[PDB]
Each structure stands twice: as structure tokens, then as C-alpha cells.
UniProtKB/Swiss-Prot annotation, chains A, B, C, D, E, F, G, H, I, J:
Domain of life: Eukaryota
This protein's encoding gene: GY4
Name of the protein in question: Glycinin A4 subunit
Shown chain mapped onto the complete sequence: 146 to 171 of 563
């Protein structure tokens, strides 16, 4: 993954290869 | 994945290869 | 992952390879 | 991961390889 | 991880290889 | 605006009253 | 704006009253 | 703005009243 | 702005009233 | 701004009233 923003970025998040587990029991 | 925004970006998220598990029981 | 923002960035987060476990029980 | 922001950055966080465990029980 | 910001940085955090355990019980 | 997500949210953005100006000339 | 997420949130952004100006000339 | 997340949050940003000016010329 | 996170937070940023000027010329 | 995190926080930043000027010329 290549990222190169000129100018004025804002909250740049180049997440990559991010396994996610989300389980909720009520 | 290649990302290069000129100008003024805003909340750029170039997520890639992101396995997601979401299970909810009530 | 390559990141090079010119100009004025803001809250740049180039997270990579970030295993996430999130389980909640009420 | 390569990071080189010119100009004026702000709260730059280039986190990488960050295993996360988050489990909450109420 | 390579970091080299010119100009004026602000709260630069290049965290890398940071295992995190966060478990809370109420 | 009232927001109260139980469980495990992700990138919640409850933006409100957000004047936006975006003009670009090439 | 009222926000109260139980469980394990992620990157919660309850931005409110956010005047935004973004003009770019090339 | 009222914020009260139980459990284990992550990068919580309750920005409020945030005038933003972003102008870039190349 | 009222903030009271129980448990184990991470990088909590309750920024409020934050005038921002970001102008870049190349 | 009222902040009272129980448990184990991490890098808590309750910035308030923060005029920011960021201008860069190359």
C-alpha cells in the first residue's frame, strides 16, 4: 500500500492487513 | 493498493485485506 | 506501506498488520 | 513502513504490528 | 519503520511492535 | 443528536452542524 | 450531542459544529 | 457534548466547535 | 464537554474549541 | 471540560481552546 497525499490531509488512516473480531452477547 | 490524493482530503481510509467477524446474540 | 504527505497533515494514522480482538458480554 | 511528512504534521501515529486484545464484561 | 518529518511536527508517535492487552470487568 | 451504541462499534462519526466548502480550480 | 458507547469502541468521532473550508488551486 | 464510554475505547475524539481552514495552491 | 471513560481507554482526545488554519503553497 | 477516566488510561489529551496556525511554503 502506497500513500502520498499532497496539500492538507485530515485524519488519514491507511489501515492494511487488519484482522477484526467483534462478538457481543447481552 | 496505490493512493495519492492531491488537494485537500478528508478522512481517507484505504483499508485493505481486512477480515471482519461480527456476531451478536441478545 | 509507504506514507509521505506534504503540506499540513492532521492525525495521520498508517496502522498496518493490526490484529484486533473485541468481545463484550453484558 | 516508511513515513516522511514535510510541512507541519499533527499527531502523526504510524503504528505497525500492534496486536490488540480488548474484552469487557459487565 | 523510518520516520523523518521536516518542518514543525506535533506529538509524533511512531509506535511499532506494541502488543496490547486490555480487559476490564465491572 | 443522541448516540448510544452498545456492543463493539467501529469508526462512529456523529457529525452535526458541519458547514462544508469545497471549491477546486485546475 | 450525547454519546455513551458501552463495550469496546473504535475511533469514535463525535465532531459537532465544525466549519470546514477546503479550496485548492493547481 | 457528553461522552462516557465504558469498556475499552480506542482513539476517542470528541472534537467540538472546530473551525477548519484548508487552502492549498500548487 | 464532559468525558468519563471507565475501563482501559487509549489515546483519548476531547479537543474542544480548536481554531485550525492550514494553508500550503508549493 | 471535565475528565475522569477510571481504570488504566493511555495518552489522554483533553486539549481545549487551542488556536492552531499551520502555514508551509516550499
Amino acid at each position: 500500500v502506497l500513500v502520498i497525499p499532497p496539500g492538507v490531509p485530515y485524519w488519514t488512516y491507511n489501515t492494511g492487513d487488519e484482522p477484526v473480531v467483534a462478538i457481543s452477547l447481552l
